[PDB]
Amino acid sequence: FPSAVTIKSWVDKMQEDLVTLAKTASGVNQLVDIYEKYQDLYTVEPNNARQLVEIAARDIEKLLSNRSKALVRLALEAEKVQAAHQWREDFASNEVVYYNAKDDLRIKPVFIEDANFGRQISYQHAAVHIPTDIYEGSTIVLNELNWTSALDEVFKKNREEDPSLLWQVFGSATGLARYYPASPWVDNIDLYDVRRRPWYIQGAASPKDMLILVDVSGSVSGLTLKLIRTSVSEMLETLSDDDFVNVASFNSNAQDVSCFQHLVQANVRNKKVLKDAVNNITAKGITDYKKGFSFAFEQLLNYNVSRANCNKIIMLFTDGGEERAQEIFNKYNKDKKVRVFTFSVGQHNYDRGPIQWMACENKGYYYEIPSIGAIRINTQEYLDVLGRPMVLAGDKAKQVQWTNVYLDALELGLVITGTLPVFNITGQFENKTNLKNQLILGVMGVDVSLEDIKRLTPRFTLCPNGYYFAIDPNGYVLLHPNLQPKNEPVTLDFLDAELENDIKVEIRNKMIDGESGEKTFRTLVKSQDERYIDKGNRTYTWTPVNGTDYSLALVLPTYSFYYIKAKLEDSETLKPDNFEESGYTFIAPRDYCNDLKISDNNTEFLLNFNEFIDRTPNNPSCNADLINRVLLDAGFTNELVQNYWSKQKNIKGVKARFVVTDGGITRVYPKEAGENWQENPETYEDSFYKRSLDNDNYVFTAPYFNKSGPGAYESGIMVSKAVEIYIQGKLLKPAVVGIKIDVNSWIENFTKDCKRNSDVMDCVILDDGGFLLMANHDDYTNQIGRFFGEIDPSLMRHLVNISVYAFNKSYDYQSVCESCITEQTQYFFDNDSKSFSGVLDCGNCSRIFHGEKLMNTNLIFIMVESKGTCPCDTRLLIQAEQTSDGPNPCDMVKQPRYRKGPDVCFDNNVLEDYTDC
Ligand SMILES: *[C@@H]1O[C@H](CO)[C@@H](O[C@@H]2O[C@H](CO)[C@@H](O)[C@H](O)[C@H]2NC(C)=O)[C@H](O)[C@H]1NC(C)=O
Ligand SMILES: *[C@@H]1O[C@H](CO)[C@@H](O[C@@H]2O[C@H](CO)[C@@H](O)[C@H](O)[C@H]2NC(C)=O)[C@H](O)[C@H]1NC(C)=O
Ligand SMILES: CCC1=C[C@@H]2[C@H](C1)C[C@]2(CN)CC(=O)O
Ligand SMILES: *[C@@H]1O[C@H](CO)[C@@H](O)[C@H](O)[C@H]1NC(C)=O
Ligand SMILES: *[C@@H]1O[C@H](CO)[C@@H](O)[C@H](O)[C@H]1NC(C)=O
């Protein structure tokens, strides 16, 4: 431990060496000089966030309006055809002809392949879906097959007028599903009912302030207990993420099963914790109805918590109950706002009389659940009886409702769909019966893919840091770079998606529910890897969409306010046989032109690209801006490689050199050094590019540890720095460059006290995130590129608590583990100080350390005495996708995120029949 001045000198020498090597071997100056010297084949253009937000909002409104129009016409035609149906019985004479999918491949279809639909499709016929439990050959379904045989013409008309429709289906209470571009069922067993789907259920009823009141007496233990638990689980599954629910189990007293005590949003986390709670039921005691309904009613009368102010109902799960509990029904229901849905799960000798009487005297309905067979079917019927006010409202109630993003059930990715209910509109010029008009015939919907939405989002005209994201009133995100499936609808809150900050909370709480404005603020930015974060400032611009409840926002860091494009008009430089002279080329598989296809193999893709370019700027239907950009970018990169990298054939310390750039061209000077390139050729999706755009200094990216593929000694350490240009006075950051540092050279030049082969002191260097990059111990350097906490936790904890390092812990619910919650920890530099000293103590012994950050880099040099003298490992610091369960769902419902609800709800209709008991 020589001295602070000695450490100063050592750090100064190391920083000067590393910075001069990176700068010289990268040629950032040369690249900026090329850009600024040309300055005539391109043209910088303003990126007006407000204007682009408005344009995207109008386009998305127009698309959704088109879909709504199609859905409306389909519903009207269905209404007419069902109105004029003669309802025959004998179908022997007229053999009903229809294509039944999932059969042994009625019609023998041709099934021609087409684009935009990965599977074989047909257009002349539509396909019919039948759940396996539903029996065909009965008149009860064959009447539906008949009257729905007339929707094919309207399907064809929709597809003809607008060729961009993805899908269109009709779901009836019978169980049929007719979707137009007839494809074989994906199943080459399945519990698929069209009724048991989010898109069906959303349109079949209104949002509800529902409660479950489980009977938990001593008599409901065993087979009936498991039956009731399964029934409650499936009722929760039936419930959506715009409703509110609790489950109380009255046992001489209305105790709460869970830790909420008031109505909660019933999103995925609440659902899961409630499933755990209802799986941990203990049933021992007697029955007392009065307390249960009193507790439920005072929960339903809160009006201090976040609720929808909509169809408040109560569902009772009981085995046997004779109490009338009429002192809580007769008096405290002048508003008549409760619907008691009394169930009967399992087998019991107790009288059904009071149960059915309570069911049909409190505006609700009665059900009987004998076994597991009926739980899947006899659970969904409450939506039919909640739809009675909706059908009575009729034209007012007929509105299109869009769902959240979810995994398409036949492998087309993430899709949102519309919905519209279909009635017995049958003779209302006289209004003869109107008795079965209460029951809904079914719903129908049209699908739009997030690919179609993102086609309206030109993400390639700005920096990779910039992006579009859209949010719903519930607060979930519609589009986001971080929005990825796992294979359950994809649920991702805005705060959950991006970083969490008071300014973001404020903008969501204040100016997203129909307001327009902008705000520039400084907040942390999470790197694309789960390794790094960085400080920066951004401005968000948002507008409301008039057509739909959704809202759109745009993100623009204050260096992508402008963008660069090609001013009007080297192609042979992108040729594999010329790689040995022009670097090893990758090209980003962007949708450059409609003729070509995504060919991620990328070498046949590169030859395809250059072949198509050879086969002519005419471009009848060929995207010109991207082609111009990539050609200009390839010109710049090739000139760099020819004029700078060619002169120095090889350098002892420089294992490789590279460049990525806006347009999608990346080049490695040796083909041998390009063979072991592992990063994808999409410029916008590699992490180090974004990292270098964010940072103002050289960024050192640690290699991975314990991974297949040689990336430690035969690849080296990767450095990066973004290029900055000034044309008329405003900053632009087109590209980044970098090199590969030879590990052996770095060892032997770091050896320049800090001798090896001994355990007295450690001389170790880190970066922003505590990843090891160099060591002299000869046992740390073998395990290079791994988190410093996993090898030396005591010193890392001392650094964290002395606050040279800060950390955030994001939670990513969308992940694959072997639903899965990942604790993503990111360490970073917080304080703007470059000198740290002190003594860390583990008890009997002591250790002296002195760290100093390297200037113009994200590196820090730490000197400390060896751990041979001080055995100290309290707990191991690990930095990975942790298997955890956080935050606590009991505590975050007390202060829930701000939410807005629909203004239109249909409950308490004046003239409902409800005569059936
Ligand atoms: C509502 O639609 C149903 C079919 O889904 C109709 O049910 C049949 O209606 C005819 C004529 O009204 C009766 O002769 C049948 O016996 C009915 N079926 C059953 C099972 O009884 C129903 O009529 C429709 N409502 C109206 C007013 O037409
Ligand atoms: C090892 O460190 C030495 C300096 O201590 C570096 O030597 C310089 O190398 C650059 C080119 O890389 C030359 O332009 C300088 O003139 C050299 N200076 C001196 C004093 O030798 C060397 O680059 C380092 N090598 C590695 C592998 O990092
Ligand atoms: C069951 C037949 C169909 C329903 C439409 C389409 C075809 C699958 C569908 C659109 N995503 C609903 C669903 O995904 O379950
Ligand atoms: C919407 O419909 C109009 C008219 O039917 C059509 O011109 C247009 O291409 C459709 N699609 C979009 C996204 O506007
Ligand atoms: C329904 O079936 C009858 C024969 O049972 C047939 O005459 C009638 O045309 C069918 N309805 C249609 C095609 O709408």
Ligand SMILES: *[C@@H]1O[C@H](CO)[C@@H](O)[C@H](O)[C@H]1NC(C)=O
């Ligand atoms: C970021 O932007 C804000 C507002 O425009 C500004 O006050 C702040 O100084 C900026 N950050 C830096 C690094 O200057």
Ligand SMILES: *[C@@H]1O[C@H](CO)[C@@H](O)[C@H](O)[C@H]1NC(C)=O
């Ligand atoms: C759409 O909403 C914006 C938001 O304030 C409003 O200014 C505009 O007038 C609305 N346009 C229509 C046609 O409703």
Ligand SMILES: *[C@@H]1O[C@H](CO)[C@@H](O)[C@H](O)[C@H]1NC(C)=O
């Ligand atoms: C990519 O395409 C080339 C065609 O030259 C082929 O040799 C190679 O095996 C392909 N790579 C993969 C991973 O399939």
Ligand SMILES: *[C@@H]1O[C@H](CO)[C@@H](O)[C@H](O)[C@H]1NC(C)=O
């Ligand atoms: C490295 O990987 C192998 C297999 O994946 C495993 O057995 C071993 O424990 C790992 N070593 C370390 C240090 O993580």
Ligand SMILES: *[C@@H]1O[C@H](CO)[C@@H](O)[C@H](O)[C@H]1NC(C)=O
């Ligand atoms: C995230 O980092 C910021 C910046 O220092 C800090 O104020 C905040 O408390 C951190 N949050 C978590 C969850 O660690």
